């Protein structure tokens, strides 16, 4: 069955960078978009961006263009998101999720989330 | 950008009863509206896509309707596992694929 | 290539007269790139038959280009489709 396994929580200083991963299994990696979603504690979901692993095509929310970098590794079936210059506004849970390449109309399975906490 | 406004912000209901929540789009999204459920401390789960199609495994007491800019999710015969937050999201034409602000469904 | 996602087109330049008796348009695409654009046009009420006379050969979204489409349409009330993105087109008679 389809699984998206996300990397462990990060507790980091202001100004640091973090790189989190989303390992896909149970399907053909390059047939599906991997999208990324942010959720602050007690607040709503926000779309960050997405990568098409088959082609490398990426799309970014304008609010995250200077914050997030999305990459993918076909050989390991893994998507990566790197967050730079972290501030307390970046403390949140980050999800990866799957959409259908060529008819992308839903995020149909979701990872368990990676918590990023920015702290002194 | 397209804005999605969800209503009500929160509501409290009892097991076995019927409730309806809505998602209003600021522009035509051609029915490309998805609904997700998220329980406390869990990942969102896809319930509905293209505004009325139930995802795999979703029981028939859920139903989506709507078109143009106004969409509705209806839950008949509420069960304990139905409580949590619900979000809508659109995938029409051009990003950002924005989410609605969420609706909190809790027990009476 | 693969077919461009029908749900990921927006108008950069809506259909308009070219000045040399054709219809030109430009779309922005937000799916995987490169891909091959499904474009067609229908006479109103007859959605089965593509009445578009495409001049642009094999229209394609490239990584850093593509999206310009040129066509000719029969007189009457038509609808132009790039994927599911649509625009009405009244074509004046000869």
Tab-separated table of N, CA, C and O in Angstrom, chain A residues 37 39 43-47 50 95 103-108 110-112, chain B residues 32 34 36 38 42-44 46 49-50 87 89 91 95-97 99 101:
chain	number	residue	atom	x	y	z
A	37	UNK	N	3.085	20.905	2.695
A	37	UNK	CA	2.056	21.677	3.383
A	37	UNK	C	2.559	22.049	4.772
A	37	UNK	O	3.141	21.216	5.470
A	39	UNK	N	1.686	23.650	8.676
A	39	UNK	CA	0.620	23.839	9.660
A	39	UNK	C	1.229	24.257	10.991
A	39	UNK	O	1.895	23.452	11.651
A	43	UNK	N	-3.456	25.986	13.995
A	43	UNK	CA	-3.854	26.798	12.854
A	43	UNK	C	-4.100	25.902	11.638
A	43	UNK	O	-4.075	24.672	11.728
A	44	UNK	N	-4.345	26.535	10.490
A	44	UNK	CA	-4.757	25.823	9.299
A	44	UNK	C	-3.594	25.357	8.435
A	44	UNK	O	-2.420	25.534	8.752
A	45	UNK	N	-3.955	24.748	7.310
A	45	UNK	CA	-2.992	24.235	6.346
A	45	UNK	C	-2.677	25.303	5.306
A	45	UNK	O	-3.557	26.069	4.903
A	46	UNK	N	-1.434	25.307	4.873
A	46	UNK	CA	-0.908	26.195	3.885
A	46	UNK	C	-0.059	25.453	2.825
A	46	UNK	O	0.778	24.755	3.220
A	47	UNK	N	-0.317	25.654	1.514
A	47	UNK	CA	0.475	24.988	0.493
A	47	UNK	C	1.808	25.705	0.310
A	47	UNK	O	1.844	26.918	0.085
A	50	UNK	N	5.455	22.177	-4.634
A	50	UNK	CA	5.397	20.790	-5.065
A	50	UNK	C	6.472	20.531	-6.106
A	50	UNK	O	6.952	21.449	-6.781
A	95	UNK	N	3.998	18.634	6.290
A	95	UNK	CA	3.550	17.400	5.668
A	95	UNK	C	4.046	17.327	4.230
A	95	UNK	O	4.154	18.344	3.541
A	103	UNK	N	-3.223	14.661	-13.745
A	103	UNK	CA	-4.595	14.963	-13.328
A	103	UNK	C	-4.530	15.253	-11.810
A	103	UNK	O	-4.988	14.538	-11.031
A	104	UNK	N	-3.871	16.342	-11.476
A	104	UNK	CA	-3.543	16.718	-10.119
A	104	UNK	C	-4.670	17.554	-9.482
A	104	UNK	O	-4.703	18.694	-9.614
A	105	UNK	N	-5.565	16.849	-8.805
A	105	UNK	CA	-6.774	17.466	-8.268
A	105	UNK	C	-7.019	17.102	-6.808
A	105	UNK	O	-8.107	17.355	-6.279
A	106	UNK	N	-6.019	16.525	-6.145
A	106	UNK	CA	-6.127	16.210	-4.725
A	106	UNK	C	-4.777	15.744	-4.203
A	106	UNK	O	-3.951	15.225	-4.960
A	107	UNK	N	-4.572	15.928	-2.904
A	107	UNK	CA	-3.452	15.326	-2.185
A	107	UNK	C	-4.021	14.089	-1.497
A	107	UNK	O	-4.719	14.195	-0.486
A	108	UNK	N	-3.727	12.909	-2.052
A	108	UNK	CA	-4.562	11.739	-1.801
A	108	UNK	C	-4.004	10.778	-0.756
A	108	UNK	O	-4.781	10.011	-0.177
A	110	UNK	N	-1.042	11.231	2.652
A	110	UNK	CA	-0.270	12.230	3.377
A	110	UNK	C	0.753	11.552	4.274
A	110	UNK	O	0.487	10.490	4.844
A	111	UNK	N	1.915	12.179	4.409
A	111	UNK	CA	2.889	11.733	5.384
A	111	UNK	C	2.460	12.061	6.803
A	111	UNK	O	1.492	12.782	7.051
A	112	UNK	N	3.207	11.518	7.762
A	112	UNK	CA	2.866	11.711	9.166
A	112	UNK	C	3.303	13.067	9.709
A	112	UNK	O	2.931	13.415	10.835
B	32	UNK	N	-13.128	21.703	-9.046
B	32	UNK	CA	-11.908	21.033	-8.596
B	32	UNK	C	-11.618	21.416	-7.144
B	32	UNK	O	-10.673	22.133	-6.814
B	34	UNK	N	-11.326	19.744	-3.238
B	34	UNK	CA	-11.100	18.583	-2.397
B	34	UNK	C	-11.430	18.912	-0.946
B	34	UNK	O	-11.249	20.045	-0.490
B	36	UNK	N	-10.778	17.367	3.037
B	36	UNK	CA	-9.960	16.565	3.920
B	36	UNK	C	-10.478	16.635	5.371
B	36	UNK	O	-10.967	17.593	5.752
B	38	UNK	N	-9.009	16.014	9.357
B	38	UNK	CA	-7.795	15.927	10.159
B	38	UNK	C	-8.188	15.823	11.621
B	38	UNK	O	-8.807	16.740	12.168
B	42	UNK	N	-3.030	14.299	14.009
B	42	UNK	CA	-2.910	13.325	12.934
B	42	UNK	C	-2.761	14.052	11.604
B	42	UNK	O	-2.897	15.274	11.518
B	43	UNK	N	-2.481	13.276	10.557
B	43	UNK	CA	-2.355	13.817	9.213
B	43	UNK	C	-3.728	13.986	8.566
B	43	UNK	O	-4.652	13.219	8.847
B	44	UNK	N	-3.882	14.982	7.694
B	44	UNK	CA	-5.129	15.101	6.930
B	44	UNK	C	-5.395	13.852	6.104
B	44	UNK	O	-4.475	13.173	5.644
B	46	UNK	N	-7.813	12.477	2.837
B	46	UNK	CA	-8.675	12.874	1.734
B	46	UNK	C	-10.047	12.227	1.880
B	46	UNK	O	-10.159	11.008	2.042
B	49	UNK	N	-12.945	14.473	-3.663
B	49	UNK	CA	-12.261	15.223	-4.707
B	49	UNK	C	-13.224	15.506	-5.852
B	49	UNK	O	-14.256	14.847	-6.002
B	50	UNK	N	-12.865	16.509	-6.658
B	50	UNK	CA	-13.744	17.075	-7.689
B	50	UNK	C	-15.155	17.308	-7.148
B	50	UNK	O	-16.160	17.051	-7.817
B	87	UNK	N	-10.965	20.626	6.011
B	87	UNK	CA	-10.352	21.625	5.152
B	87	UNK	C	-10.769	21.385	3.708
B	87	UNK	O	-10.931	20.240	3.280
B	89	UNK	N	-9.697	22.526	-0.427
B	89	UNK	CA	-8.547	22.942	-1.221
B	89	UNK	C	-8.929	22.893	-2.690
B	89	UNK	O	-9.632	21.981	-3.114
B	91	UNK	N	-7.727	23.018	-6.900
B	91	UNK	CA	-6.630	22.697	-7.808
B	91	UNK	C	-6.900	23.194	-9.226
B	91	UNK	O	-6.467	22.562	-10.194
B	95	UNK	N	-1.467	27.808	-9.543
B	95	UNK	CA	-1.221	27.902	-8.103
B	95	UNK	C	-1.335	29.338	-7.624
B	95	UNK	O	-1.376	30.272	-8.439
B	96	UNK	N	-1.397	29.567	-6.301
B	96	UNK	CA	-1.312	28.588	-5.211
B	96	UNK	C	-2.571	27.740	-5.054
B	96	UNK	O	-3.680	28.230	-5.277
B	97	UNK	N	-2.387	26.470	-4.689
B	97	UNK	CA	-3.503	25.564	-4.413
B	97	UNK	C	-3.939	25.806	-2.970
B	97	UNK	O	-3.628	25.050	-2.047
B	99	UNK	N	-5.810	26.496	0.620
B	99	UNK	CA	-6.722	25.814	1.523
B	99	UNK	C	-7.722	26.809	2.096
B	99	UNK	O	-7.418	27.991	2.271
B	101	UNK	N	-9.853	28.033	5.473
B	101	UNK	CA	-9.374	28.261	6.827
B	101	UNK	C	-9.676	27.149	7.809
B	101	UNK	O	-9.142	27.174	8.923
